[model samples]
Target: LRPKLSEEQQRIIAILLDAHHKTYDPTYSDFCQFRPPVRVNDGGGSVTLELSQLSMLPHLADLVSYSIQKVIGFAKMIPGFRDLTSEDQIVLLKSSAIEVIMLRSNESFTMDDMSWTCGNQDYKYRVSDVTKAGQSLELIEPLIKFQVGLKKLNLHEEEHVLLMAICIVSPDRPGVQDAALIEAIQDRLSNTLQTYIRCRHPPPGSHLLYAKMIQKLADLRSLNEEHSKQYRCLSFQPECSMKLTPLVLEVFG
Candidate 1:
């Protein structure tokens, strides 16, 4: 069994917990209250809190630093975003909040005109019109190109791409009754859902719910895909450059 925390350690833990809860926004704050203990020797040694630990209760410097390293490492492994800077990497993670905005859109509105405001800054985008829903590739092409540009600049590529899409369509639609609109919404939604799954790694409880939602969305997409195939408008490109996978479909419900 693990040893119980010492009185001093417990005090530190309390401070850490409180700070973690209070200043959890990594974008605003760049430090964590508690630094996980480091091991110095194999046999064992008594751990003491570092002075850095006591300097601030709600800072995220450590967390941000760790995130930078983690993202850089992941970028190296992932097909995209391998060349982004540490700061750009953090921006990508924080940008996932764009999904929260997109998921809030009404199902009735075929074209969603939305904007993302963060840290007193705003970015605007418009969802593709249902009339142009069949052109999902065309609609998303610009956003994808923007993402590639960010990657070229050594900024967060995958994260920005996914979040930008989320910011575009997360809100509710107002007049989405047309079959064409529904098809477009489902296709874009499915793609966004897949992208979210591919990029962000949410924690257990909320994350699990999100995973379920992604699955449901995928099932819905498949059902719609079948429906669309009845008409000559739907093209099945299973061998297309970007093949959809079950894992990719795991982000939305």
Candidate 2:
């Protein structure tokens, strides 16, 4: 971190904010533009989500892939990212793309029943529905819980974008060719993130928030197989064929 944010660090922060603006402007993105309509019933403590047919699944995949590629593009815009060997970039993106989905999709997640609603509908696919279909998606519940906690931290656009980048640029991702190089980048990211959080929250500022976010990134690895399963499944069906992009196949294939 170099004990203080230098000019280069400041430039990096500005770049991240620009990336945030380009990717998602808080209220809108291509990802959320065409979501399926849904409704959920508040059944006491538990809620039941209703589906208006199994629509949007294919578009959903497309949305995720687009968002993820943009996120990867965000990483590429970082000052020293291109200096790394080609293999490291590929390794880092493959390892982190779905995790970015885990993070970005939360923007549309419904808190009451954990349903993903579209077009201001009342319900979406329920957890049990996916479970009944043989995919419990076990990690999804914890992942949403983590999103709820992160939301509680009250992150603004800049902080949210910074965290997304921090999650993507991991030094510990398997097959990383240069852990040392990634570490330096992560340290700068951490410094920028921690500093802004400190300034934003003041005394009781962002306590344990960074730790918790990192923990969720670790937890995201559990969803790798599940993500790949659905990704592969899309290829086998004609209706869903357009959903899986070539870059996504290269990463998840």
Model 2 is weakest, by summed lDDT over 10 consecutive residues, at 45-54
**Tens digits of per-residue lDDT for model 2, 144-196:** 66667666666666667777787778898889989999989888887887776
Q: What is the lDDT of residue 164 in candidate 1?
A: 31
Q: Deviation in angstroms for 108 in model 2?
A: 3.0
TM-score of each: 0.19, 0.73
What lDDT score belongs to each candidate, Candidate 1 first? Answer: 0.30, 0.63
Residue 87 displacement (Å), model 1: 11
The sequence of per-residue lDDT tens digits that candidate 1 reaches over residues 1-253 is 2233445433433443343333234343322233322322222111122221221111222332343333333333322232334444334333332232122111111222332111222111222211122223332343333333322332122333333332322223232223343344334434443434434434342234334544433333343344234212222322211222222122111
The runs of at least 3 residues in candidate 2 whose Cα sits more than 4 Å from the true structure, single-residue gaps closed, are: 1-5, 25-55, 110-113, 116-118, 122-135, 225-243
For each of the candidates, the C-alpha root-mean-square deviation to the true structure, in angstroms, is 24.3, 5.2
Shift in Å, residue 94, candidate 2: 1.3
- Backbone collision tally, model 2: 6
